Structures are given as C-alpha cells and as structure tokens.
C-alpha cells in the first residue's frame, strides 16, 4: 500500500489500484506577496483622476 | 501478517522527525 | 500568495496493487473520513495550525 | 450506468461502483452582487 | 454571485452495478477525459459559453 500525495493519472491505474481521491488539487498561480511600493516622483496627483 | 507502506518523503505529507535519531520505528516520521 | 482558481482538479489516491484484498476496504476509509471531516481536520493541521 | 451529477458518498459506494470523480466540486457562499450629479454636497445636510 | 473558496470538496461519479463488466472502462474513460481537457471543454462549454 502506497499512502502518498501520489495523483492519479490514467497510465497508473492501469498497473495499479487507486482510492477514491482524500484531497483535491489543481495548478494554481504564485506570486510574490505585495509590499508597498516607493511612491512616484508625481505622486501628489493620486487623490483625484486624471 | 504485518503490513509494509511504501512512501516518499515530501512535506507537509511525510517529514524525517526531528529527533529521529532518538526513535526508532515508525516514530521517525510525522506529517499528514 | 496564492491567487485565482484552480486552472484544473486532480487529486491524490491511495494505491493499492492490482488484484490485492485491500483495496475495497481503503477506498471506504477514504470516503468515510472525508464525510466525518477528519481529512479536512488533517489538512488544516499541517497547513495553517502548523 | 448512471452518468448523472451523482454525489461520491459512503453509503452509495458500498452498494454501487464509483468511477473516478468527473466533477469536483463543494459548498460555496451565494451573495447578491453610481455618485449622484451632486454629490459632493453630501458632508452636509440639506 | 459566488464569493470566497469551496468549504470542503465532493465529487461527481459515474455509477455502475457491482460487478458489472463497464467498472473498469469507465474507469479509465473518466481518467482519460479529464487528462486531455475534454471535461474541462465540456463544463466550460455549459456554463460559461452557454
């Protein structure tokens, strides 16, 4: 018995036997976490809209 | 009939204790 | 940081050898842990409480 | 062969073989999803 | 509108007698589908294009 993060892919289960999955997972997208940025040279400008 | 359980090490899934070296058995491991 | 969906669902099985006496009685397990929350109890220890 | 939106659960499994999950799913929340002409005078009461 | 993630995960199976002789094919017909995006292109399909 293999109990592992192991994903279960159709070439696998035809050698072995699967379980029905115990946690889902997918591709997702990382990213640095945002800081606060220097501010512009014009930034003065920020509180109303161009 | 004692039962074997193959498995990789990755984290937080299966991790080498961290005072494996004073256990021994199936203590050596925690994780999910 | 994490951000967005999942682009795509996998998952992660226990194996077991084909042909084995196991097999049926680990995919109930697994579902009749997923019902009572302990793999959701699981996820959350080594993820966020850890 | 049911090929239906069939929920995975315990009491199914035991009485039915369950093929691998072609929709994952699970609860989600629902919630319900402009300045007026003069409103910069809104500080103040009228 | 949908707000925030899944609160815990589920999953929709294809159903088969016990015993049956379609257990396995559709077994592996489901893995292969989802492993080439035909059922990522199906629920897309009916529930954003449409």
């Given at each position: 018995?293999?109990?592992?993060?192991?994903?279960?892919?159709?070439?696998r289960?035809?050698?072995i036997?699967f379980?029905?999955?115990?946690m889902?997972?997918?591709?997702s997208?990382?990213?640095?976490?945002?800081?606060?940025?220097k501010?512009?040279?014009?930034?003065?400008?920020?509180?109303?809209?161009? | 009939k004692?039962?074997?359980?193959?498995?990789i090490?990755?984290?937080?899934?299966?991790?080498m204790k961290?005072?494996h070296?004073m256990?021994?058995?199936?203590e050596?491991?925690?994780?999910? | 940081?994490?951000?967005?969906?999942?682009?795509?669902?996998?998952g992660?099985?226990?194996?077991?050898?084909?042909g084995?006496?196991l097999?049926?009685?680990?995919?109930?397990?697994?579902?009749?842990?997923?019902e009572?929350?302990?793999?959701?109890?699981?996820?959350?220890?080594?993820?966020?409480?850890?």
């Amino acid at each position: 018995i293999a109990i592992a993060p192991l994903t279960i892919t159709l070439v696998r289960e035809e050698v072995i036997d699967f379980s029905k999955p115990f946690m889902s997972l997918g591709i997702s997208i990382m990213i640095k976490k945002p800081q606060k940025s220097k501010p512009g040279v014009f930034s003065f400008l920020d509180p109303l809209a161009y | 009939k004692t039962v074997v359980v193959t498995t990789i090490l990755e984290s937080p899934y299966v991790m080498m204790k961290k005072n494996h070296e004073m256990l021994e058995g199936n203590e050596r491991y925690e994780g999910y | 940081m994490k951000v967005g969906g999942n682009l795509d669902s996998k998952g992660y099985d226990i194996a077991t050898p084909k042909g084995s006496s196991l097999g049926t009685p680990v995919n109930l397990a697994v579902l009749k842990l997923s019902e009572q929350g302990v793999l959701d109890k699981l996820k959350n220890k080594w993820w966020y409480d850890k």
